[PDB]
Amino acid sequence: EAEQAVLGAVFLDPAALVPASEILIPEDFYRAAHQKIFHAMLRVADRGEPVDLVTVTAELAASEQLEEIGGVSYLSELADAVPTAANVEYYARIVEEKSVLRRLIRTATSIAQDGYTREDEIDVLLDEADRKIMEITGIPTGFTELDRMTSGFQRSDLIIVAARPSVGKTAFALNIAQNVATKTNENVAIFSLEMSAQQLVMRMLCAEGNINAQNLRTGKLTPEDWGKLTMAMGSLSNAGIYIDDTPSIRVSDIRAKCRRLKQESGLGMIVIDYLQLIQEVSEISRSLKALARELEVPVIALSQLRPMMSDIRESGSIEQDADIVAFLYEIIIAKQRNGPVGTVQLAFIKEYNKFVNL
Template structure:
């Protein structure tokens, strides 16, 4: 009879599932042996995934021992062994990569970063909220200024902070009774734990002495949560088949920069100290003793340096002009004068971002200008034997220079900030040059819909880059046709193309003007020669930079010489003004 019952049961058994091929290191040793050992069609007491083993054997306890060992290997306590079958099956299903379609207990994977709790400083949040209730008005003002509701990881703490901020702005007392009533009136008292939890927070600390420490912990955890959220979103979008790599990378960089700004020091607002004032007096005394030496990088143009006192860190210098007026030539000349200084000890690394010209064209301009060779003649191949030594010397100087060139077209502001960071931190660049700013792209979707907003975003990003990296930035810009319709064609700042953001964010604006460009008749050329006191054949060399804005000095025209065949600007005046009478320029009668 027993044999017949066993045979009948055997006929009703479902076919055994095929043995799963699992990685050697994916499962604990006991789980691997129990899954891989049974052969197809054979019942095994030691396979917890075999559906025929849903009910235990009456005789012997090998399967229970196996489950106990597997439960300990999977990280479950012994007291939960009653549920270990579905728990371990769920764990094994996830480790092996086979989805578990049947219902059952859901186990949090302690090894997956996607299911771990987000970073939060709960104790620090409680201490901060208590400090706001027992602290002074100034403390609450600081908290509401530096923190926001999303700074708190616990939803209840975010609601309580929002309530305290609203009460503080309304001039209400911020004790626990007033806070409880405020939250009750808004129907939020139950969402934050009820009156009992408010009372617990109020009595959590005796004083608010360590408020700054609590606030710093809360900010740090907030930054970590933002990093996780941004990285998770970027990873999810990177898996999409239609993802635009360039746009995704730009958005990733923009988000990273924004998160980085959150982690910066918030103690920038502070009263003037004695040390700061004394330091400024020492700088003034040093400048007096240096007898006219510049406070920043020299552009190589003496009269321009006299107007600007050199290119200073954290400043934006804009040089604008119409097409073919010499914007790129001026930017290239300044970069060359600093990176290829005649005194090797004075050479400084310069990063030149050319969005308009290819890298090869920038190098050709520098080579031919330093060799004093006609660019058009060289391009046509009409060279003399005497030109080669000068060209070789120019090439040798360029090889030893500290010039960094990036010719990425349509560079976005996020890409620029990322590459500027590398140029300054790794290549030690002391100056950044952008040719030219209107070709740059914004990074946000909102700005891309409006060109004026896009330029505002670009200029704000450039200014933040200059301040963060502590370097001066030269931007070249284009002006519109308004100057050509004006008598004399002299440009003004109102002619800056597309946006007033350039005028707003720049510390210095110089408008390039070459009067001979607009002189179409001999009479016009004679008027220019008379006005600028040059010979008629030198009219084409007359160039001016009209300084329309200068936060650190005077405004007005700066006279230069322009050599069109070399695409090069030169000094009109030979010596700088100086506090030393022996070195001072002589004023022309």
């Protein structure tokens, strides 16, 4: 009935079409007949010309669905029936609602129906089941003058740190995660898709007790090294670091694991190791932003590519989803919504694998 109101009110105002079309597409209509009309209605509006009884009946005739609806009789029925066009929008919202409900049902019924025919998948089934159904502040960084431009890292922002291979993007994100763990009291979650979980640990053990030329890797240590690891181990032994080196994981699983950790222990940072390596990327970017929003936590997504904006942009959106885009080169905060944009300069040790102040 509300369907007939919209159609009707268009024949009446017919500036009514504008709000109607801002809220409906032909597909929202349940009856094909109306679909046809509303489409013709729009197709006449795309000139043009304007939209009224004779001009629509004429587009319908043209594409030959005039008699496939009502006649002109049903168009007139609609026209003569409607008493006002101050609703429409409406009416529109009603039809739009009942449309959403049909889609809900359809995509939900498609899941049950799909439940028996796969079996087989469980994981594809459970993912294309979310996919189908979906359709200083702050936290201190450790580093004095990165804090200032940003004031955190704050909760619900997606931070993307990009840098060419072997500039130090991992070693940078790890130190952030480490400082946040050892110095605050806030659990950090690391996904290290590339490197193993234990080859990650010494890379932050080295980062602390200022250990290693001697080296941890190459067997034996001096008394100074030993007496060092012991506190480095000790200090990092109480930190709130969680690691997950699961080979290469899909978004929904980062999201599921992070979700469970928030309720049981705390959570403050999600540091994902590199995006390009998670498993189009624009559709992942989107999901990472939502993750941050849902968990009121800053998500640091590392990325792979001078540098500047169009280096990453050309490969999957990101730009409009991430609210702060860092570059390692110099730390170039090229985009942030907190405020300032510029270059912060950090020293880098190597031997110890630390990024340090200045």
